[PDB]
Subunit: 243 residues, 3 copies
């Protein structure tokens, strides 16, 4: 009745996003039929990858393929216990969050060099996050990895709010880029807060069911809604984008 409850929280939190990612793919495909080949069609292709990765990720977690048990180190609020870890999330972020950055980058028309470095910083953020969840030898190391990951995040954040906005202004998309940048910054901040507050971190919240739902809700906005806003603006502003 707490295990019954913890398991109902887990499975529902995964099944919903398998549904919602699936539906988003369908809708994004239907939307792409009335978009002119070119720079709009490039932004659309990049955008469609986002839920395709997300549904893969969630099939990963549902099947157990990318879920494991981790013994928490001495000093942890749950020291000496095996904790459920959805390390599949941290893994697939490393492919899905660069799809987001590619869409934005194409939208804001950035320098490929800036693009390559941001995406590199982003893959570093994701991988050191996974290192943090997997590290079992000491509490010191888990949070050192957390902090390195934050440093990467900052690199990604800086480029958005400076260079990429600058590129957006002279590409004619500064306004829509600024709507999306805000969503992205606000919502991406949710993830390290969830990690820290949740069971892998401080464990102020000890239900993995709850933390899993927290990530799932964040995915809904950061991926599917983000992607839907992008596509609606692009289909309405095709000339403002092409060439």
């Amino acid at each position: 009745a707490a295990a019954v409850r913890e398991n109902a929280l887990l499975s529902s939190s995964l099944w919903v996003n398998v549904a919602l990612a699936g539906i988003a793919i369908l809708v994004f495909v239907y939307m792409g039929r009335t978009i002119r080949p070119g720079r709009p069609r490039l932004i659309w292709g990049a955008t469609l990858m986002i839920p395709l990765v997300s549904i893969s990720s969630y099939l990963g977690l549902l099947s157990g393929l990318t879920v494991g048990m981790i013994e928490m180190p001495a000093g942890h609020a749950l020291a000496g216990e095996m904790v459920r870890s959805q390390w599949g999330r941290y893994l697939t972020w490393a492919l899905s969050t660069p799809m987001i950055l590619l869409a934005l980058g194409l939208l804001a028309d950035v320098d490929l060099g800036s693009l390559f470095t941001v995406i590199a910083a982003d893959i570093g953020m994701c991988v050191t996050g996974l290192a943090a969840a997997m590290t079992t030898s000491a509490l010191l190391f888990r949070w050192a990895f957390y902090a390195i990951s934050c440093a990467f995040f900052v690199v990604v954040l800086s480029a958005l709010v400076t260079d990429w906005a600058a590129s957006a202004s002279s590409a004619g998309t500064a306004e829509i880029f600024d709507t999306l940048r805000v969503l992205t910054v606000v919502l991406w901040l949710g993830y390290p807060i969830v990690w820290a507050v949740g069971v892998e971190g401080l464990a102020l919240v000890q239900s993995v069911g709850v933390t899993s739902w927290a990530y799932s809700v964040l995915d809904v906005f950061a991926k599917y809604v983000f992607a839907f806003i992008l596509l609606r603006w692009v289909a309405n502003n095709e000339r403002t984008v092409a060439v």
Copy 2:
């Protein structure tokens, strides 16, 4: 005499392509001595990577490093048995099939955005294929992963047959691009057919020796012959390509 036979099928299927990939590298290097630095030399560099990855892949499988046993889930034609899985193949495809796409892309002179998205879809195809072979918890999940992988493949296929052909026409290479696109589409289709028909899939064919040979033969055409045709046309048409 069936184990003697299954093992002779396996080892020969791997050793041949170690030989053939090795020879292709030698020949491609010799061919590259009479190619002018520039766009031809870029296509050649990209093309040479193809067998270099392939020989690595096959050394992986021969040494056992990238081969494992997988228990098939309930409902599978071979439910409850350990099946030999050459998961090394699925792994290295994720680096070799983007080398192919890079060669084609350079040949057809595509938009880097289209390039980045195709390659991303391609890496998604390969990784979800591996997810499908590794999934053991249920039959449903194995084929859901198969289907997601097909969705990625379709993304890759669409870009070739539309955008990338369009780019080929105005880059002066539409004719050679169209020869290569056809080879690629026809032969890449062979891979999910082999998976489905073979032991990891439906198991209409239960010899892993046979399925391994089927992949090996597909590699011969999709990589080595593909790469040989590309290089012969490029060395004969260097002006039609440069700048």
Copy 3:
């Protein structure tokens, strides 16, 4: 007193570079405050990633997350024994050595195609190196992987010394590119020599403490000093670089 000594060699060899990478990040950040946004700021962003990856790598090894024991195959100087392997190094190289190549590439203003192929060859070099250290089934295979890895290295080396220098000449940076290319070639050569001479290879040197220190010292020059020279020249030559 030999175990006491072997362990003091190991931990000091890792802790030093956690320190030094940490300090380099601080200094590189401080240096980047007086660099004009643009092509200089792109080179700086790429350069800063280098120690960020390196410190991650070393936190990986210190925590045990990326260290393992490997049984050496028959015919090895240490056949039948478990050897300490810092496979974390081989792993993270695959992300850090492309940051180096990106910096150089941005500095020399190369063709993205050459860039993509070099980086691909570089990731191949790193991954087949890891294959070599992990292979346990036979000595033949370990060195075949060593040799494939060398072939990749050669691809990377050729592009530097020909194409990328050519690009450097007409981008106005040939002189600084040539200083950096020399450092890179000389120092990157150190790594397969250390592997071969050390315990994973021939085992002319059987202390993993010693080989670990050898890699650590190579990182100091190939990453931190390399990166420091790059940044000092860029801050002094911003007009020679921009646009």
